[PDB]
Design a protein around this ligand. Structure first.
Ligand SMILES: *C(=O)c1cccc2c(I)n[nH]c12
Ligand SMILES: *C(=O)c1cccc2c(I)n[nH]c12
Ligand SMILES: [Cl-]
Ligand SMILES: [Cl-]
Lengths: 295, 295
């Protein structure tokens, strides 16, 4: 019983975190086999190809705890620097670089000066920002999922935007969203609520005995989607209805009956009631998150 | 910027988690130096001294990943079993066994069959329960804080109570609260809201630019405490006012001015507004948690 924002155990990622310094700029890197990955900003209008051609291997200080790693090669891939080192990280887990979709969740290991500070779950918002928790020095901190023994790295932290939300890249240095790794007027676009996640979370609440918000009513996909649009919820698709199948089955509540409940919650609010300890409709749990945690 | 329920990085604890089996009962243990700690329930009205005297070392299967640990001694300390093993855990961190107070937070590493599944933050409620997330098999999962390099273990998971909340022990096997490790009519007592934490979190919101709920008003400790009692909030003490000092100073808001804001929030509710992404007054962040995460 119970329902928490649960992160993956961070051990496998902690053994990969290093400190990278160039000049008087320090930030975090990720040490997998004999490569260290970090934000190319570590070498800072800028023209990064110009800035990098002016560097040598000896201009990069990499520290894994105490041990200094010798840099023997450097190259840029999009917004990430790859520092080749003379030692394979003996703690390298099985890993993959995957890009996630808006609406998907991942764990963030927040790190300062190469030292892990804390782990929390995040969703990629529809507007390709994340509502993270990051202070000066967290640049290079990574986001990940773990399946069996395999770490799927999906995010590397770069920027804080003016609304206090966060912007970064996948591990091949491609930004999520229309953001750049320099100072501009850039701002988060308008965001939406992740409908499939809100329905997943209502399923979690049912599995955990919160049933107050249910009703005998139903609706069609199309009449649901007309109320969705009105309250800045993204459209529900048949794929979404299909991925909610296993939760529908476990609870005996049709997806379109759960939609009728959500329409009533959006039209009436909660009348001072809570669901799974929240007074608002939570949208940062995926169907997979609910199945992973509930039973 | 941002404010998340952040857990400690779990690596140091993951390297200590083992599986313990006795008969057909399996649960989790904690392997520190040459001792394994687990819930004595693993040997299950029961009379545990009777049950334990009937066991031998060979009746305990301890598995650290694949490696079977040889049990060379067994003893009971309150509700915890101590299995002496022939090998010191080479991954033992610096550690302490500390008992926490109601209102204090800790990280939970939820584990199944000796394998870590997920990490989340919990508070010890005033009624000495925790609102955890635990499924069958999580028995033995531990709660902890980390200071520098030192793991302070504070909780070992035992029971789910009929409201779906959780009960366990400190690492010397002394229960938090008036609970026993057997089936009875036992239930959580009435709970209260942790006032000092709610004020800490309002400070976090200010540090992060949520200031809508502030007012020009003040109150005394005693007039605050009269509204506290009415809404099932615990009393605020001068110690509490003292521990809020550093957050008061950083924000320039007197503790008793923040109390006046809280009284208004309790009397009026939020009028459909949010604070740090919540529509209700959050009480599971300590003053230390806010200082740790904010700046
Ligand atoms: C990390 O701190 C980081 C990464 C990319 C761009 C920037 C900027 I402008 N300031 N810090 C950055
Ligand atoms: C762990 O599962 C555990 C610990 C203590 C007591 C009990 C009981 I009764 N069922 N499971 C227990
Ligand atoms: Cl790999
Ligand atoms: Cl120690």
């Amino acid at each position: 019983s119970g329902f928490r924002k649960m992160a993956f155990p961070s051990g496998k990622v902690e053994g990969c975190m290093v400190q990278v310094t160039c000049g008087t700029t320090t930030l975090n890197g990720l040490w997998l086999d004999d490569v260290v990955y970090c934000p190319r900003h570590v070498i800072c209008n800028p023209n990064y190809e110009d800035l990098l051609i002016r560097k040598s291997n000896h201009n990069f200080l990499v520290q894994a705890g105490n041990v200094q790693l010798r840099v023997i090669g450097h190259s840029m891939q999009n917004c990430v620097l790859k520092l080749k080192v003379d030692t394979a990280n003996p703690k390298t887990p099985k890993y993959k670089f995957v890009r996630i979709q808006p609406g998907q969740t991942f764990s963030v290991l927040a790190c300062y000066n190469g030292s892990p500070s804390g782990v929390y779950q995040c969703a990629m918002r529809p507007n390709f920002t994340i509502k993270g928790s990051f202070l000066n020095g967290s640049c290079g901190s990574v986001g990940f999922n773990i399946d069996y023994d395999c770490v799927s790295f999906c995010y590397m932290h770069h920027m804080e935007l003016p609304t206090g939300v966060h912007a970064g890249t996948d591990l091949e240095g491609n930004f999520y969203g229309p953001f750049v790794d320099r100072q501009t007027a850039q701002a988060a676009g308008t965001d939406t609520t992740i409908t499939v996640n809100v329905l997943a979370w209502l399923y979690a609440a049912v599995i955990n005995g919160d049933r107050w918000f249910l009703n005998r009513f139903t609706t069609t996909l199309n009449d649901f989607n007309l109320v969705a649009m009105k309250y800045n919820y993204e459209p529900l698709t048949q794929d979404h209805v299909d991925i909610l199948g296993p939760l529908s089955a476990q609870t005996g509540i049709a997806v379109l009956d759960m939609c009728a409940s959500l329409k009533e919650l959006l039209q009436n609010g909660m009348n001072g009631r809570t669901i799974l300890g929240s007074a608002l409709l939570e949208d940062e749990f995926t169907p997979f998150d609910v199945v992973r945690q509930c039973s």
